[PDB]
């Protein structure tokens, strides 16, 4: 019942949390992500919450189990809604087209230092439409 590109988007989302590449999310592997988002978990809390998703009981959820928890929730339109949610908040200009000037300004938040000029070389690649200023449609091309 799950639509084919959704699993493919669930593929990459699964790999976004499966750093080691074996298809198994260990508690420590999941735990480091939650510190990276600011929350400070106890080991028991992580291991408790990981049990409910684990239908097999092996202690590490595989992708078939991962789909079931993904199917648990309504991601009916949340995917492109989040895509538009980012395009709205990245649109600091508010013109409806996102300039490249603040593209370096938000990617610095994670700690990247890529040069100012080179991104608008990459936004030009994004701007196959050639806008010179990225919109949601370019973001849809990006994603």
């Amino acid at each position: 019942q799950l639509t084919e590109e959704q699993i493919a988007e669930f593929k990459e989302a699964f790999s976004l949390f499966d750093k080691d590449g074996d298809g198994t999310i260990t508690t420590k592997e999941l735990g480091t992500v939650m510190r990276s988002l600011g929350q400070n978990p106890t080991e028991a809390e992580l291991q408790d919450m990981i049990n409910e998703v684990d239908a097999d009981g092996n202690g590490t959820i595989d992708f078939p189990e991962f789909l079931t928890m993904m199917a648990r929730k309504m991601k009916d339109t949340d995917s492109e809604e989040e895509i538009r949610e980012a395009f709205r908040v990245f649109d600091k200009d508010g013109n409806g087209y996102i300039s490249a000037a603040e593209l370096r300004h938000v990617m610095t938040n994670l700690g990247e230092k890529l040069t100012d000029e080179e991104v608008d070389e990459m936004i030009r690649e994004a701007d196959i439409d050639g806008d010179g200023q990225v919109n949601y449609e370019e973001f849809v091309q990006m994603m």
Partner: protein
């Protein structure tokens, strides 16, 4: 599995026997010294049980067999060096010691002088072989016992330094005694001939033959898919081959041509005077590959599964990496025919586009050609004109018959731009950059015919009154491309356009075709007029004056000023890509106090 080195075919020579006996004496000397330091001293009788040793006696008095266990390793090492193809040449010391001819011996130490690097690699390799021989005998010993794998059965390189130590030390000390004697041994072979001028050895050349015959295989695969396209089932065994092509060759071409663009573009012209010289035949076959890829992608987009955008990007970067003057000065007939038929293909393609976009508004081949026209064609032609005008190779690329082909293509493109619909509004942006590239590409001033006659490098004048009729030339340079205006005509167009102040929603085609058109037009006739070519007086392609320059600047800036009141949009942000050449064009004197108002408004 150790592979043996055969030594039966080779045999020991006799002039070497002097050094063989000398090194046997040296081995006896080192062995005698070893046992004296160990405490072994001369004994009356050779008894192992009495724990004595008489063999400190001189090598003259050593028996034949003891010489055989010195000569044995020596002559097998010599047989495995001569069996390698290591020649031995003539030295001085044979003649020198020929003109020579309670005892304490002394052995020269091999430690002091150092070996050269080449023969050091030679010695390491031959010690690898000696370790391999040890592995041989140890292996037969291991089938004899039946078990107990010796940990040293791993290859020589897998061995550690301590494990390599004995065999290496043998290599140094034997070759070192050879050199202290003076006998110099080296590689037996010197290279016979280098086929350096051959382009076939170039990895790019080989990869390119690979690329073209895979492209031809893919074209035959598309012909197979076309013969099965009349049938209902296009599922063929060639599905694996076509997806291999699409997800390997095209990405591989893409990465290769972005990584080595500097190689492809310049045959060591501007950068890297030492190397990086792209061959002329290499450029020829690169252009052939681009042409056949363009033919393959044409009329067949629907078959490709959304990787048509990847193919468009590949064709785009191939366009930026094309070369034309090399092809024209030295070109093969297949490439000539491919380019002529590519211009012709663009001809009937544009013609059928004007036909179908009008006729078949209401009713798959038609859909794939419409999509091709909308996205996969105009950026393609734009990039073609872009590299043509960037490298100026178009001067001789489009010299004969391709002036008229490009200028009738200009008529068709200009008519398409003047025609407006929803799909044309969607592609207003593409026409700007495309016509910018074409205006920067076209060598003669296709707008003004006035001074194109005074320009020698023109289709009609260069091909004269007989090739005039031979080609597709109606004897009129300006009339063969009727719809396109002149510089004068576009000048009054611009002046009343400024005096009017039209809205974008009214005349979108004007500012989304002609403005980038002129913005990249102007650059070539800088150097082809008195503009940046004050010399070649009255022979220039066109003549322009600073007064006209300032007038057109004032008109464009004033329409931009009126145009600030409608947000000014991202559509001049689109035109800004080719206004970047204009803002590099503009002299810094203007950048003092003539344009600061408008960038201040931009800062607003």
């Amino acid at each position: 599995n150790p592979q043996p080195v055969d030594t039966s075919n080779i045999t020991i020579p006799e002039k070497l026997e002097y050094f063989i006996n000398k090194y046997a004496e040296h081995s006896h000397d080192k062995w005698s010294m070893d046992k004296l330091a160990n405490g072994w001293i001369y004994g009356e009788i050779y008894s192992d049980s009495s724990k004595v040793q008489p063999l400190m006696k001189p090598y003259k008095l050593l028996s034949e067999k003891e010489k055989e266990i010195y000569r044995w390793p020596i002559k097998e090492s010599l047989k495995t060096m001569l069996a390698w193809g290591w020649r031995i040449e003539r030295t001085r010391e044979g003649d020198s010691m020929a003109l020579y001819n309670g005892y304490s011996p002394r052995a020269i130490d091999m430690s002091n002088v150092t070996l050269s690097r080449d023969l050091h690699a030679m010695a390491e390799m031959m010690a690898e072989n000696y370790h391999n021989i040890w592995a041989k005998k140890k292996k037969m010993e291991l089938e004899s016992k039946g078990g107990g794998n010796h940990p040293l059965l791993v290859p020589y390189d897998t061995l550690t330094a301590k494990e390599k130590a004995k065999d290496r030390e043998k290599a140094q000390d034997i070759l070192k005694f050879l050199q202290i004697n003076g006998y110099a041994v080296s590689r037996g072979f010197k290279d016979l001939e280098l086929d350096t001028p051959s382009i076939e050895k170039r990895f790019a050349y080989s990869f390119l033959q690979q690329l073209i015959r895979y492209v031809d295989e893919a074209h035959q695969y598309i012909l197979e898919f076309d013969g099965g396209s009349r049938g209902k089932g296009e599922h063929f065994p060639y599905e694996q081959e076509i997806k291999f092509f699409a997800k390997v060759v095209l990405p591989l071409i893409d990465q290769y041509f972005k990584n080595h663009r500097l190689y492809f573009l310049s045959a060591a012209s501007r950068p890297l005077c030492s190397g990086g010289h792209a061959s002329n035949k290499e450029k020829e076959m690169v252009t052939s590959l681009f042409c056949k890829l363009g033919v393959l992608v044409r009329h067949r987009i629907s078959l490709f599964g959304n990787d048509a955008t990847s193919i468009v990007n590949c064709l785009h970067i191939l366009g930026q990496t094309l070369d034309a003057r090399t092809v024209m000065k030295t070109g093969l007939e297949s490439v000539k025919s491919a380019l002529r038929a590519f211009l012709d293909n663009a001809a009937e393609d544009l013609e059928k586009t004007m036909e179908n976009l009008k006729q078949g508004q209401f009713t798959k081949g038609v859909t794939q050609i419409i999509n091709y026209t909308t996205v996969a064609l105009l950026p393609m032609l734009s990039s073609l004109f872009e590299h043509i005008g960037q490298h100026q190779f178009g001067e001789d690329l489009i010299l004969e018959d391709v002036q008229v082909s490009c200028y009738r293509i200009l008529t068709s493109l200009y008519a398409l731009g003047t025609s407006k619909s929803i799909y044309v509004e969607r592609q207003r942006s593409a026409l700007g950059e495309c016509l910018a590239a074409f205006a920067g590409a076209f060598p003669v001033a296709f707008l003004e015919t006035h001074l194109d006659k005074h320009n020698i490098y023109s289709i009609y004048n260069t091909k004269s009154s007989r090739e005039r009729a031979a080609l597709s030339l109606p004897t009129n340079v300006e009339d063969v491309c009727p719809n396109i205006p002149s510089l004068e005509k576009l000048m009054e167009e611009i002046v009343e356009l400024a005096e009017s102040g039209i809205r974008y929603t009214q005349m979108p085609h004007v500012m989304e075709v002609i403005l980038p058109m002129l913005c990249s037009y102007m650059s070539r006739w800088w150097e082809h007029g008195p503009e940046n070519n004050p010399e070649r007086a009255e022979m220039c392609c066109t003549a322009l004056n600073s007064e006209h320059m300032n007038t057109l600047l004032g008109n464009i800036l004033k329409i931009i000023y009126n145009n600030l009141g409608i947000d000014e949009g991202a559509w001049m942000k689109r035109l800004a890509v080719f206004s970047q050449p204009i803002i590099n064009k503009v002299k810094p004197q203007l950048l003092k106090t003539h344009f600061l108002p408008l960038m201040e408004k931009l800062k607003k």
